[PDB]
């Protein structure tokens, strides 16, 4: 039934990578919830999903429509995904035992413009900082370097997470 119904029925029973070019707001999160409800009910294994949004308020709205679950799903911002799944469990493995595991990550004070100087903030004064440029991400690039270096980070993120939902 024209562009409305056939787009919904072809997006529920799909199983591959999906690129949806939705409109200018007004309910893009309806299909994000409805796909997750279809994907979680279809899959009966121990694998869980991960939903990523930018603002924290939309993460609560996705969580509100979903309900609650004990499957180990991650619903939240992309900053919370990188800081809690890649860096904090595996900082002491990939970048030496002397690197600390607990830190506070403020993005209000630091304005450094070097990667190697960035590790000196984390190693010495227990602060996780941010890059100088808006066209950079020190947190997301550190998660790429830890995943590329250590092994047990790669043994985690494939075997728990089924599909990452991006918005």
């Amino acid at each position: 039934m024209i562009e409305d119904e056939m787009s919904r029925e072809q997006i529920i029973k799909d199983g591959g990578n999906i690129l949806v070019t939705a409109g200018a707001g007004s309910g893009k999160t309806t299909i994000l919830v409805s796909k997750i409800e279809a994907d979680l009910k279809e899959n009966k294994t121990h694998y869980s999903i991960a939903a990523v949004t930018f603002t924290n308020k939309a993460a609560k709205e996705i969580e509100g429509r979903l309900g609650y679950s004990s499957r180990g799903n991650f619903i939240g911002t992309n900053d919370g995904f990188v800081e809690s799944e890649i860096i904090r469990p595996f900082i002491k493995d990939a970048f030496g035992n002397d690197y600390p595991d607990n830190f506070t990550a403020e993005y209000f004070d630091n304005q450094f413009a070097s990667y190697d100087k960035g590790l000196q903030v984390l190693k010495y004064q227990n602060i996780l900082g941010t890059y100088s440029n808006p066209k950079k991400n020190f947190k997301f690039q550190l998660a790429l370097d830890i995943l590329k270096k250590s092994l047990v980070a790669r043994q985690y993120i494939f075997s728990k997470y089924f599909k990452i939902f991006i918005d």
């Binding site: 469990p89 002491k92 092994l151 047990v152 043994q155 985690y156 075997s159």
Partner: protein
């Protein structure tokens, strides 16, 4: 995932007991208290219903001495390089393990002392190494380990079964059905089984057998059990012979049921029920001695072997003979089988003088290899000179020529092995049984009765 070992540093009945593990474990022994405390230690480590109550005063070795209970389990978390099972078995935990190439995973328990506030305060920790152990992160009343293991306890998600005494109020055909179900069907991937009936071990393979010693201080010995492809065609007979013999203290390995007739008549006359103290007669015939000796010496059970010196003709070859009787116990001793020997005899008469010629030959090869016979007698391997029948004629020969009106009484009993032995032991007296018990060639009976020196 394959269980490696469990060590209990303290419990209500254990002092320093370390038991090697595998999948499909079977525990037995004399001390039932130690078995149920082993299963209770497993429930304390892996089940929340016993974990949430804490420790009491009574669950210690001494009730005030050395207040430190530790139960450590080894997991062997990695798999083969051709399988991606390693990743999804790794999945649940994040920061326990440090090394990128970590092969071993530990699950440990820690108990607070009971001097203050009168409680146990169960503290759990995993980690990849025994040092720098990290506490299990729990957010509410459920910690992270509860979503991994699902423990099902049977007594009349990784699924772990714990079965305690399933043979009670059960017919034996259902016990054979049950043993087929755990040892063949892939649903029972992990279990621990405590049993007292041999019918639950009638079909077993790729299993770990744990025995508890009879002493009040429990010592546990474990053996990994496997049946090879060469023994797979007659596997049921070894399993049925071994399941009943696993529950004894001293065993005797013999060849045929005629030796069972003779030895059981002798033991009934001289010994007041040797089976009560743990003596068992084992029936093995046509197979090799290495499997039973390995599975009994690894399990802590002493074994005594009485065997004959027999010659085998080689199939399709005439005049060449095999030294089976020596070679079985040399390959028990780890030595290679000796070379094949031959004799050149005319056709003559095949009935009577032939057995005399091989009897003289057997005496010669016994006389050639006396140092090996001394090493054989160093262990509990008692080898007869020609047959057991000639030792019987050397022992009870007067009564044997009294019973048998034949001039030689050793030929009539070799004419029919089974029927002549029953008629021999039917008209026998008590004094002759003490005579064969006294004789040095039948010292296997003296070792089977197991009289303690001190």
């Amino acid at each position: 995932m394959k269980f490696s070992n469990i060590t209990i540093k303290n419990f209500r009945n254990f002092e320093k007991v370390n038991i090697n593990l595998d999948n499909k474990n079977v525990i037995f022994g004399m001390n039932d208290i130690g078995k149920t405390n082993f299963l209770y230690a497993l429930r304390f480590l892996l089940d929340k219903e016993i974990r949430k109550f804490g420790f009491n005063k009574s669950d210690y070795h001494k009730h005030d001495t050395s207040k430190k209970i530790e139960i450590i389990l080894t997991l062997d978390l990695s798999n083969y390089e051709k399988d991606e099972d390693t990743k999804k078995l790794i999945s649940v935990v994040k920061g326990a393990r440090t090394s990128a190439n970590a092969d071993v995973f530990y699950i440990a328990l820690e108990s607070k002392y009971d001097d203050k506030e009168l409680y146990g305060n169960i503290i759990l920790k995993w980690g990849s190494e025994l040092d720098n152990l990290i506490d299990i992160p729990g957010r509410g009343n459920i910690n992270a380990l509860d979503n991994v293991f699902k423990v099902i306890y049977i007594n009349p998600k990784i699924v772990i079964y714990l079965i305690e005494e399933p043979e009670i109020s059960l017919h034996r055909s259902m016990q054979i059905a049950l043993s087929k179900q755990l040892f063949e069907q892939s649903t029972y991937k992990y279990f621990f089984l405590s049993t007292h009936s041999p019918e639950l071990l009638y079909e077993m393979d790729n299993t770990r057998l744990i025995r508890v010693h009879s002493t009040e201080k429990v010592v546990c010995s474990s053996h990994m059990y496997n049946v090879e492809e060469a023994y797979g065609s007659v596997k049921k007979k070894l399993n049925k012979a071994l399941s009943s013999a696993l529950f004894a203290e001293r065993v005797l390995l013999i060849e045929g049921p005629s030796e069972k007739i003779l030895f059981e008549k002798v033991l009934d006359e001289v010994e007041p029920e040797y089976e009560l103290n743990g003596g068992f007669l084992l029936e093995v015939g046509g197979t090799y001695f290495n499997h039973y000796v390995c599975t009994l010496n690894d399990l802590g059970i002493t074994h005594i072997i009485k065997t004959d010196n027999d010659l085998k003709s080689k199939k399709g070859k005439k005049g060449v003979y095999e030294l089976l009787g020596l070679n079985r116990c040399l390959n028990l001793l780890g030595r290679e089988n000796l070379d094949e020997i031959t004799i050149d005899i005319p056709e003559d008469i095949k009935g009577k003088k032939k057995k005399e010629r091989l009897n003289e030959r057997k005496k010669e090869i016994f006389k050639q290899y006396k140092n090996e016979v001394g090493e054989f007698l160093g262990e509990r391997i008692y080898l007869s000179e020609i047959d057991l029948e000639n030792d019987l004629y050397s022992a009870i020969g007067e009564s044997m020529k009294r019973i048998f009106e034949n001039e030689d009484p050793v030929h009539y009993l070799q004419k029919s092995k089974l029927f002549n032995m029953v008629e021999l032991v039917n008209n026998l007296s008590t004094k002759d049984c003490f005579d064969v018990f006294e004789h040095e060639k039948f010292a296997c009976l003296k070792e089977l009765v197991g009289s303690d020196r001190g």
